[PDB]
Amino acid sequence: FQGMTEYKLVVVGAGGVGKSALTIQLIQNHFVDEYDPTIEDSYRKQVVIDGETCLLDILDTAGHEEYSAMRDQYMRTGEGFLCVFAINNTKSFEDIHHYREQIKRVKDSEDVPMVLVGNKCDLPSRTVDTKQAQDLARSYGIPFIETSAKTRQGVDDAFYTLVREIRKHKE
Ligand SMILES: Nc1nc2c(ncn2[C@@H]2O[C@H](COP(=O)(O)OP(=O)(O)NP(=O)(O)O)[C@@H](O)[C@H]2O)c(=O)[nH]1
Ligand SMILES: [Mg+2]
């Protein structure tokens, strides 16, 4: 034993869905109201999950990005992925298929640890129903979690659930 177990997590999804707001809530317990588009940013946090001390390396990605050899190179470092859409943006939900295919391509595998995240659950303008998201997640064999980066609903659960999926795959 040389130190804690390390887990490399990557947050993906369409522009504006709340990838950065979810990550900053986890790290800083702060809600970011401004929309500052991301290119690529990295964060770290030590936490305890199921009685195991873990070091989380979190990579926050761009939601507006053409094909990039450089995008593939950082995505291939990930061990697990949060696939994020916004519950008031039907196009972001339809884009989940594209993110899943991109991940399978870069990892060259059919069985990659992933969690489906439906964010902005605090807003009144829901267009994607809970049952539709749950059916999509069941079709992939992965968990679904509803979140709000503003209220903090589900934020810790999303990241911890992804770590649990990585552990099941390793073992
Ligand atoms: N009401 C509410 N607003 C949110 C929520 N999560 C994010 N937002 C808002 O949505 C906007 C975009 O959030 P942001 O985290 O920057 O999205 P992103 O997915 O990182 N965008 P990009 O891909 O361009 O980096 C911000 O104005 C933010 O305050 C939420 O759960 N509820
Ligand atoms: Mg961002």
Numbering used by the authors: -2 to 168
Text taken from the publication that reported this structure:
The RAS family of oncogenic proteins is important as therapy targets because of the frequency of activating mutations in almost all major cancers. All family members function by signal transduction to the nucleus of cells via interaction with effectors (such as RAF, RALGDS, and PI3K) that catalyze phosphorylation of downstream proteins. When KRAS is bound to GDP, the protein is in the inactive state and becomes activated by nucleotide exchange from GDP to GTP. Mutant RAS proteins remain in the active state and hydrolyze GTP at a much slower rate than wild-type (WT) RAS.
We determined the RAS-binding sites of PPIN-1 and PPIN-2 by soaking KRAS169Q61H crystals. Weaker electron density was observed around the linker and tail groups, suggesting that the rest of the compound remains flexible when bound to the protein. It was noteworthy that both PPIN compounds have the same biphenyl anchoring group but different tail functional groups, suggesting that the biphenyl-type groups of PPIN-1 and -2 are key in targeting these compounds to the pocket I-binding site. Our data show that PPIN-1 and PPIN-2 bind to KRAS at the same pocket I as several previously identified compounds, but they do not disrupt RAS function. Phosphorylation of AKT (downstream of RAS-PI3K signaling) or phosphorylation of ERK (downstream of RAS-RAF signaling) was determined following EGF stimulation. The PPIN-2 (and control Abd-2) had no effect on the levels of phospho-AKT or phospho-ERK even at 20 μM (addressed using Western blotting), but we found that the three cross-over compounds caused loss of phospho-AKT or phospho-ERK, as did the previously described compound Abd-7. The previously characterized low-affinity Abd-2 compound does not affect DLD-1 viability over the range of concentrations nor does the PPIN-2 compound.
